[PDB]
Amino acid sequence: MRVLVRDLKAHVGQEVELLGFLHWRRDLGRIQFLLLRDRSGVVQVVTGGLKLPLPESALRVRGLVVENAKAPGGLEVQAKEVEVLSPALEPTPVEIPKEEWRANPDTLLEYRYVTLRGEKARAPLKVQAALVRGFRRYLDRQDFTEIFTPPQLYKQIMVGVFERVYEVAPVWLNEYLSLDVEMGFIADEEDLMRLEEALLAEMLEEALNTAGDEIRLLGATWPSFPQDIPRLTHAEAKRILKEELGYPVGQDLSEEAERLLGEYAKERWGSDWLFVTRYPRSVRPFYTYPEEDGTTRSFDLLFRGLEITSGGQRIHRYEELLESLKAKGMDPEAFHGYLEVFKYGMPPHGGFAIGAERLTQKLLGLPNVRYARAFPR
Amino acid sequence: MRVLVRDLKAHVGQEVELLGFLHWRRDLGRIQFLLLRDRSGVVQVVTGGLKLPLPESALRVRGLVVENAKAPGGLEVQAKEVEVLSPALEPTPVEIPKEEWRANPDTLLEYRYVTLRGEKARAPLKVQAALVRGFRRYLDRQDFTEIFTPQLYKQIMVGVFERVYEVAPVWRLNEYLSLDVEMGFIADEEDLMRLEEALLAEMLEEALNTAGDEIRLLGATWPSFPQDIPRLTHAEAKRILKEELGYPVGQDLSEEAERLLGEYAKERWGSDWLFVTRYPRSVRPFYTYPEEDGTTRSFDLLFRGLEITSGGQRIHRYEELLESLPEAFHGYLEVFKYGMPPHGGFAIGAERLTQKLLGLPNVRYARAFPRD
RNA sequence: UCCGCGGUAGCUCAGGGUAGAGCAGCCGGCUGUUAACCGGUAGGUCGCAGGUUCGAGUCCUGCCCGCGGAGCCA
RNA sequence: UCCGCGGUAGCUCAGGGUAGAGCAGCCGGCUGUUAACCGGUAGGUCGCAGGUUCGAGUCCUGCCCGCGGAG
Ligand SMILES: [Mg+2]
């Protein structure tokens, strides 16, 4: 029976079998040390004599668990046998154990197919899966049906079918993971924003539970709790940036602007979260539910200065869609295929999407969003 | 506080608020009958006089729950107020309530955006969702890590997490959902075949739990339990098709052959499931683990005569990859220079599994928005 | 296009006269290493193709990749 | 590729001389409908483009599309 590094303290004094990779080796001749990496951690293995493969070789190690303050984690294994399941032919391009430092951020990307093996490298990917797991959990408990489509339209079509649906699919920095929610029979864009506060809360919970070790391994600072998130109207934000930050802003907020509104919110409310509501019709799709004062039932979520979520209520009346197409100078009978479904009693609905990697990145304090993705372009 | 159709019996004699669509209406003058569909089913609503929107209109109904044998499901609502949240402008192309019949197969597909609203139409989709919920739940409990990629990638991720899975769309009917599993540090293909059995079991369990009503609605027949599934080597099955089924088979089993082997399994073992092991190298990808006798550590799962799973062990020795090819795949091989664990995997065709489980006429019924 | 900084060993980087050293590697040595270190030894499209020079990694010309600034963006 | 059935209201199918019927739609009637039905009414690229005929959904030449069938 195999034992994971994370379960060693329970087998202190016992004989154990280990399966992992040769993380790193230090040969002193008479005695030598093995760092053995598995999906749960790394553990020191003591031995001697016998030749060892190059690092990154698949290994089976059978030995005796022992306490030792000298070893990382306070525990080590005295080797009785070291079997090699798969030997490494050459030395790795980069010294994996000596990451993240020791290798420029760019070199790490050129050798993703092996640098990803590092503890800190894989960590974000583990935390992300946790976030997504909690994502589905909550929505499922809330009577959401997961759908599998071939984009904005299909979700909508499915609302007249299941009332509440969600999807986790790739979209086109470049190619990213998008967590899309869409629910029917709502009152207004408020219903959506409330759902997202609860959903995010759950998503973070799941990460904190099933991905604690990784979260601590990265030394990330956990955000304030996603509840009663501050709301600013696009106009209100436009004014603050101007009069208080001396940063002239256009009709649409730039990444640079959102960064500032973030820092602003962190100071006035001590909140790592910020809701920007009521965008102008001009900067939002034609299907966005319009308001009388020239704005729209929309919103963006700024987590730590970065936008991680965009959504709002859609138009559901057939005529009001044409109305919106004309006002935005667009050919109505070019959207004939899209308009069809709205001829048949479409409920008041709306949705939003979360950027998995954006969220992951700003959560773990990663330098670049590309770290939150397994294989960037 | 909204009440779903499935929760009405607990509210008899009380005042409830319903949210759904006008599934159908029967107007008899001073009295009319509404069939109100929501995500949990349809209930009969009684009223009279007032104009009712065309079918398929979004509605809000406040009324009193009442027992009545004449009513479908034994329950009906006497409405005190009928609010219209969104009127339908035109009649639907097809009479949704009168599906599946009453409309040719190819027609339902041409009006998906609305016919999908039928109870039997959406049923498979709800079930496929359950099957996938189970898929993830099990693998999660077994220390698997879910990954999100742009075949090779899954392998690379093995040296990172040892055990990974992914639920992603593929191409190669035209666009289908694939449930891919890949795990390292295995003994042989047996470890994989044993995992798939335990997996399918958990999956069908989840379908039963969370998609029970739909499974009953479609009137499907449940398969035998996926355990100790009969195994049959490619050579062995080849012979059976020939001598006992008089169906000449080439170097590769055609769909027609696979369907006959299914009927065979149901007779000999009374099993809706069947593994086909040991395929000739010639008829399997280069990355497949070769054997001494020309065969390979591969397998195919035949659910009710239809392949729903294909897999086997992969080659993990850098040299043996060129040996089974070379410099064309220079970017692929690179990872195999650095201690690749003995590994393997398989992928499940989500729609295929859902189709054959629910006895659907054709695979496209399991897909929300099929290609053409 | 102009200015500036970058392009040198598997990795990180030094430098008008052999192109050099740490880490990774190889050989030898070493019973407690935490980025072990000691000796020896291998390792190159110095960006590429042409010039000045006895001599070019260094200077000249053109061109290729990258970052920042100026400019351009009727 | 060949062969054989198909293509008519929206849907599903009737048939050498206004192109029709029930389903739903519209108007009118009905307090227990389960695919409610009674009357009235609206609804067309008869596949598309060329021929025979005084007249073609109907026949005959080519093509597009669907289903099915062949070692
Ligand atoms: Mg000029």
CATH number of the domain residue A76 falls in? 2.40.50.140
Q: Residues A202, A138: contact at Cβ < 8 Å?
A: yes
User: Which segments of A26-180 does DSSP mark as H helices, in order?
Assistant: 107-110, 112-115, 119-141, 152-162
C-alpha span between B265 and B267 (Å, rounded): 5
Helix, coil or strand: residue A38: strand
User: Which segments of B269-359 does DSSP mark as H helices, in order?
Assistant: 318-323, 330-333, 350-357
If asked whether residues B75 and B1 sit together in one domain, one would say yes
Chain pair A-B, CB pairs under 8 angstroms: 169
Please state whether strand C lies within 7 Å of residue A46 at its CB atom: yes
Is B372 part of any domain?
no
User: Does A156 lie at the interface with B, CB-CB under 8 angstroms?
Assistant: no
β-sheet bridge partners, residue A38: A41
Interface test with B, best of A1, A148, A335 (most B CBs within 10 A): A148
Residue B355: closest CA among B304, B299, B286:
B304
A338-341 CB contacts, 8 Å cutoff, 24+ apart: A338/A153, A340/B113, A341/A153, A341/A156, A341/A157, A341/A160, A341/B113, A341/B114
- Distance from residue A105 (CA) to nucleotide C70 (C1'), in Å? 29
CB contact under 8 A, B156 and A113: yes
Nearest C-alpha of chain A: how many angstroms from B330? Answer: 13
User: What domain range is A12 assigned to?
Assistant: 1-92
Last residue of one domain, picked from the residues A92, A109, A126? A92
Residue B249's CATH number = 3.30.930.10
If asked whether residues A179 and A256 sit together in one domain, one would say yes
H-run or E-run covering B311: strand B306-313
- Tell me the residue type at A60: R
- What residue has token string 């086909």? B276
If asked whether residues B115 and B85 sit together in one domain, one would say no
- Tell me the residue type at A312: G
Structural domains counted in chain B: 2
If asked whether residues A11 and A108 sit together in one domain, one would say no
Resolution of the experimentally solved model in angstroms: 3.0
- Tell me the residue type at A193: M
Q: What is the DSSP letter of B337?
A: G
C-alpha span between B157 and B183 (Å, rounded): 9
If asked whether residues B9 and B138 sit together in one domain, one would say no
CB contact under 8 A, B146 and A129: yes
If asked whether residues A137 and A276 sit together in one domain, one would say yes
If asked whether residues A78 and A108 sit together in one domain, one would say no
Chain breaks in chain A (C to N over 2.5 A) after: 150, 172
- Distance from residue B274 (CA) to nucleotide D70 (C1'), in Å? 31
If asked whether residues A74 and A100 sit together in one domain, one would say no
Last residue of one domain, picked from the residues A92, A107, A137? A92
User: Does B125 lie at the interface with A, CB-CB under 8 angstroms?
Assistant: yes
Kindly provide the residue ranges of all beta strands, DSSP E only, lying in A28-92, ordered along the sequence. 32-38, 41-47, 58-67, 75-86
User: Does A74 lie at the interface with B, CB-CB under 8 angstroms?
Assistant: no
- Residue A55, CA: closest nucleotide via C1'? C24
Helix, coil or strand: residue A286: coil
User: Does A148 lie at the interface with B, CB-CB under 8 angstroms?
Assistant: yes
- Taking 3-state DSSP, the helix, strand and coil percentages for chain A, each rounded to the nearest 5, stand at 35, 30, 35
C-alpha span between B231 and B192 (Å, rounded): 13
If asked whether residues B355 and B309 sit together in one domain, one would say yes
Give the distance between the most distant pair of CA atoms in chain A. Answer: 84
If asked whether residues A264 and A132 sit together in one domain, one would say yes
Is B236 part of any domain?
yes
Spell out which residues of chain B touch residue A150, defining contact as CB-CB under 8 Å: 169, 175, 369
If asked whether residues B117 and B82 sit together in one domain, one would say no
Last residue of one domain, picked from the residues A92, A120, A138? A92
β-sheet bridge partners, residue A300: A276, A310
If asked whether residues A98 and A30 sit together in one domain, one would say no
Please state whether strand C lies within 7 Å of residue A103 at its CB atom: yes
